[PDB]
Write a protein that binds this ligand. Structure first.
Ligand SMILES: C[C@]12CC[C@@H]3c4ccc(O)cc4CC[C@H]3[C@@H]1CC[C@@H]2O
Ligand SMILES: ClC1=C(Cl)[C@]2(Cl)[C@@H]3C[C@@H](Cl)[C@@H](Cl)[C@@H]3[C@@]1(Cl)C2(Cl)Cl
Length: 272
């Protein structure tokens, strides 16, 4: 029940996803691993312990390395996973940038708006891709040979990022619905610095109409009533999480620098 333009739109998004999402993380390599003002620190300590994961690395030979993080003992040990997480997020950001550049509607925007949209949406598209490898039964992001497992229930769901991942996963979305969510987030007309507000706003409305129509054509079941509105509400929540997490990053960076060059670009840090 989709128009020709709508089916072409979904095809181009699925094509871009297929070419730029390394779903087995086969090409994520050479990453760092953990080794073998007072009111600012209190806040940064609160920021960093809201996400506690162990790390597992499965070797191509069948060997397994497992890392269990330290407890907070009021010292620098809270930063032990930051270099690794910077490398993983940088890796994800490159895939996201490649995704945008493959899409015709994005290529056709002026380069300054391309940049402003990527700065605005890179984190959100990263989270959307990570949700597709999240295992909600085991609390683990399964990234090929790497796994990130939440450390020991309804308590962890208090953290908005974690509640987001569990709630989005339980909607049991199709690949097409995920990539349309990525498009709607990418083409957000109200990101800081956007000039072609009207063009971006019209593109976003078309991706949202395509998603609403896709759901109406392919999901008649009572469990999926209001699915389109649930997704849109999740995208609003993701924007709030984006703003919250950007402020945590800048606080951590202020007292303990760790952002990679690509992270600095996307998040406004100039090097001075
Ligand atoms: C997720 C946190 C805020 C967002 C931070 C971030 C945000 C963006 C990014 O590219 C990398 C990282 C690594 C550290 C993350 C933090 C670790 C704990 C904190 O909640
Ligand atoms: Cl998404 C995101 C990724 Cl990707 C990183 Cl590198 C990390 C990897 C897995 Cl554990 C997800 Cl939950 C986290 C965060 Cl919030 C961070 Cl910590 Cl940004």
């Amino acid at each position: 029940g989709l128009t020709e333009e709508q089916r072409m739109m979904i095809r181009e998004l699925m094509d871009a996803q297929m070419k730029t999402f390394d779903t087995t993380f086969s090409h994520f390599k050479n990453f760092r691993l953990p080794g073998v003002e007072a009111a600012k620190w209190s806040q940064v300590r609160k920021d960093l312990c809201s996400l506690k994961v162990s790390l597992q690395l499965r070797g191509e030979d069948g060997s397994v390395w497992n890392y269990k993080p330290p407890a907070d003992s009021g010292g620098k040990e809270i930063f032990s996973l930051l270099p690794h997480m910077a490398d993983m997020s940088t890796y994800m950001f490159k895939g996201i940038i490649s995704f945008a550049k493959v899409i015709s509607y994005f290529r056709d925007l002026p380069i300054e708006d391309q940049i402003s949209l990527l700065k605005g949406a890179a984190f959100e598209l990263c989270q959307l891709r990570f949700n597709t490898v999240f295992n909600a039964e085991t609390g683990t992001w399964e990234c090929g040979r790497l796994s990130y497992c939440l450390e020991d229930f309804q308590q962890l769901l208090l953290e908005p990022m974690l509640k987001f991942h569990y709630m989005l996963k339980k909607l049991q979305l199709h690949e097409e619905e995920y990539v349309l969510m990525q498009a709607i987030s990418l083409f957000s007309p109200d990101r800081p610095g956007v000039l072609q507000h009207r063009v971006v706003d019209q593109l976003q409305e078309q991706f949202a109409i395509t998603l609403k129509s896709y759901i109406e054509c392919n999901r008649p079941q009572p469990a999926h009533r209001f699915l389109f509105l649930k997704i849109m509400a999740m995208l609003t929540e993701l924007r709030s999480i984006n703003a919250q997490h950007t402020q945590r990053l800048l606080r951590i960076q202020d007292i303990h620098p760790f952002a990679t060059p690509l992270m600095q670009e996307l998040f406004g840090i100039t090097g001075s």
